[model samples]
Target chain A: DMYIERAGDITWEKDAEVTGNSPRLDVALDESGDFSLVE
Target chain B: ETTDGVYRVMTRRLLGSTQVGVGVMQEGVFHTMWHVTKGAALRSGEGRLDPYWGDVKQDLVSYCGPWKLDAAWDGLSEVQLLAVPPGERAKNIQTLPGIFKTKDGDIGAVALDYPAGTSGSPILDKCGRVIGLYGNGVVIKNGSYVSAITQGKR
Candidate 1:
């Protein structure tokens, strides 16, 4: 099976609204999240 | 190519016969690139695009350089597919692009139009990761080789 997209129990959406001022993906990496993507 | 302006391969040549493919724009845009080839489609310069290349042109897409990728979309829902082995049959993803071998076992290359084991090696699924041991046209886990869209009709 293949998977796409990411999970963010961290910030909110695409915006870097968290206090740390990190991009969404940055927050994902900083929070131990990674996955494959497809179209 | 998204980062250093290097347009990578989605492996059109691997399509074998038609030798063209679609590329999901990454790093630069969120849309897609259609039947594009940087060097292979052969500019033709023969006054018309190739028969298979209907309304698109390579140098033109190349002319529109620096195409950008939209990068990641954090708002999108996460994919939750269970890693089910082949022939097990699942509900959510029974068939992404259903290609299978016949009883006779044909190495049917799609673009070339054969019928079994067409993909160099049978594609395998593992712990949510797809391994293309000498294949193309499918999703793969991170740090993997280039892939392209499945060629021909389902």
Candidate 2:
């Protein structure tokens, strides 16, 4: 599975705020935070 | 020769043919063609947009582009430039004219006749070559909405 985490300063509304600091996209975490792709 | 050049790439949270956005595949990885805003929105958890994939397996979703399908129907699927994918209520599209430049000057195309879930989908020419890929089409301008497309090549 894959997962993601927002930056410390990011908000939950504005779509443009998640950039300038790429978030975490881990395909290894056991716990799902944002999204996941499973087989 | 139009084909299924568009692929649905959405999390479990955004379920449905019209709710989840799209992307194109080149090499092995799926490319959203720089739909940064869509990417941003997906990351943000606003309006049922929470990031979750439930238990939806990868094989259940087929990598195909846009069209009409029964809500109970599940299958695989791009873009403007007058293209068709051959199933699921296939619709027609003619891209709008003009370039949508990113803040950093990544050239993109503005489109019309597309729905919300078409982001990162591909636009094909008559010869079956991808001309552009759909990105975010929710940009507001003069009180109207428009689509931004990432030019296809790489």
Candidate 3:
């Protein structure tokens, strides 16, 4: 099996202001193996 | 029981399943074979033998065995055989020249770090049995062109 070492993590805000075409990001505890942001 | 924390990795690419098997003989080897599915049969994609893709279908079969470490280093042991198609059998042979690292606990799973641009074709045994595959095209060196397959009978 191939192994990968995690370098680090990046954090974001919940209701942050808008920017260019960049999509808004969300953060939450990953449960059921799924994590997504609803707009 | 062998030492713990031992594992094997391919230092080169293009070697076939059998080559991987033979490489870890003294320590141990695993063969992951693939089986095709009916629904995805007609999909237009690179075949498992395709050098660029190397994609197998569904099921995979792995073979494990013991290898002679010292002998391998001395050039007495072989890990893969070379073969050409149409003739339907293995006709060429190449051996690895190095003492690859191995983990004790996971003797079954060894890893070799193959250099980029490595490639090979699968070679069948004399009896038409699927023995191993070959690749990397001509040049010989660790991570250079090479074939992969199981250890052939002495």
Candidate 4:
């Protein structure tokens, strides 16, 4: 939910929403360049 | 109370108390003060005092003088100051100092504390000025307020 540090590269998809703010989606890459799912 | 050639720029006071489970602990009071001035150039200094028990106090202080800019255009500067606390120096390496990342979040601050002393190649600008001194392999990024050991001026 906060800061995340990975040993290798990886990737992930995430959706975010802020109260009274716009909704957004993000794609993240890990240290090992791995892929993950987020919503 | 003393303003001979130095000036008092800023100061901060903090009080901390810890509570765990059913036990409560009062950590007394802690105070920190910082002074900045235009001595030869822009200089800054700081002092900290922590009161533990009655008549028992711990004090830590340090100062920085005017900084000399280097030549490189990539963003680099040089600062010559007396020795700093090992703990404080370590905190500057991983990330920029608090003076620069006031609103950037706490990540940078947390990172800085990791790299305290590292030996590396010194950084110089095109002007041939001593922009930054590279000590350890770790490179500390420079910011508007404080200079780093690695990234030079930011």
Candidate 5:
């Protein structure tokens, strides 16, 4: 069984280079410099 | 359910099947490392055998529990990518980190190693917040570098 904090706070960064298109994500950066979609 | 939205994704192999990676469910939307969806198409220019959602629908299945998708295909394809790959114009593409792009837009990577079956496992930080996903590993000149797909959020 796996568990995650759904409401946990995650640091996010923005990358304007990636166009928010299908497959290609346009999103934020994390402390480790990971670009992701938080919403 | 004791299980959180963190679920593992798997794909069909020749005889049996293999683990693609893990994913996190956020607001009824499941977020997975891009490479999990990339599978065999990692470095190829060819399109996936299935569409974005089709990849999630056919080639992938969620563990922890069956996924109950609320959004239609409209938003199912929308997902957060941990990091972007380096552009073709960039040099030292291999040496660059595959997860984070450098100041010059060169790709970057996390050197953490993971086993073969753990490709899509979540890379949680000290506090347990998912910071990245275990992408894959490569053995080069002297040592091996484990490539991690970095991404996270609340």
Candidate 6:
């Protein structure tokens, strides 16, 4: 839920690029890194 | 009852079923591993039939590569769990069943009695051989444990 609150729904491949070229390990990092359920 | 909460939490949190009824009989050598089926929950794109979980479609495959398992096992075999055992039984095992917060975010026992929680928990025999996962929903006709269904013995 923490991740979702920040990132919204996302996917894996696209996740690698959620925060641009650099890694977004938390918040936006969390959102872009997984299959988030946030809307 | 024995509990394996850590097993469940770590797997799901890290974004990983990835275990279960793991065993094969190709030779005297044994093989056992993990299992799970939260496929759709993790990856809404793929269905249950998918080979893996999480958005990345990760299955049991990990950089850190990895058991022998019982043959013809079921809910009736003698079983032991890798999780926390009940406080009543803890003394026999010489260790108290550890405590922790439950899925609901409330502090609770790592072990839970069946007909009360998920039935997919593994039940093994006294010899430490896994029989089958038991829970109210999964293991229908719960609480009817007995002995192994031996090939020759009764």
Find the candidate with the highest TM-score and give its number: 2
lDDT of 2: 0.32
Residue-wise C-alpha lDDT for candidate 4, range B37-140, written one tens digit per residue: 11112112333222222111111111231112222323222222112222222111111122112122111111121122221112223232323333211113
Candidate 5: stretches off by over 4 Å? A1-39, B1-3, B39-101, B105-109, B136-140, B152-154
Against the true two-chain complex, what DockQ does each candidate achieve? Answer: 0.03, 0.03, 0.01, 0.02, 0.05, 0.02
Which regions in candidate 6 have their CA more than 4 angstroms from the true location? A1-39, B1-6, B10-37, B40-70, B74-78, B81-118, B136-154
iRMS, all models: 21.3, 18.1, 24.7, 22.1, 17.0, 21.4
* Per-residue lDDT over A1-39 for candidate 5, one digit per residue giving the tens place of the 0 to 100 score: 122222222222233122321122223444433344323
Q: Each candidate: what lDDT?
A: 0.21, 0.32, 0.22, 0.19, 0.35, 0.21
Segments in model 4 whose C-alpha atoms lie over 4 Å from true places: A1-39, B1-65, B70-121, B136-154
Q: Which window of 10 residues has the lowest lDDT sum in candidate 2 chain B?
A: B68-77
| Model 2 agreement with the true structure over A1-39: per-residue lDDT tens digits | 111221111011212111111111112112221112122
Q: Order of all candidates by TM-score, from best down to worst?
A: 2, 5, 6, 3, 1, 4
Q: Which lDDT tens digits does candidate 2 get at residues B1-154? A: 0122344434444333232455433332333432322323332223222221111211111112222111110111112332222123223353333443332343334435345444444555433445545443333334444443334222
Model 3 DockQ reads: 0.01
Candidate 6 docking category?
Answer: incorrect
- TM-scores, all candidates, are 0.20, 0.40, 0.22, 0.17, 0.39, 0.25
Best by lDDT: 5
Show where candidate 1 strays beyond 4 Å: A1-39, B1-17, B24-63, B79-154
lDDT of 1 by residue, B29-130 (tens): 212123333223322112212223211211112222243321221222221111112222211111122222223221211111111122221112222222
Error of 6 at A13 (Å): 45
Better of 3 and 5 by lDDT: 5
Here the TM-score of candidate 5's chain B is: 0.44
Docking class of 5: incorrect
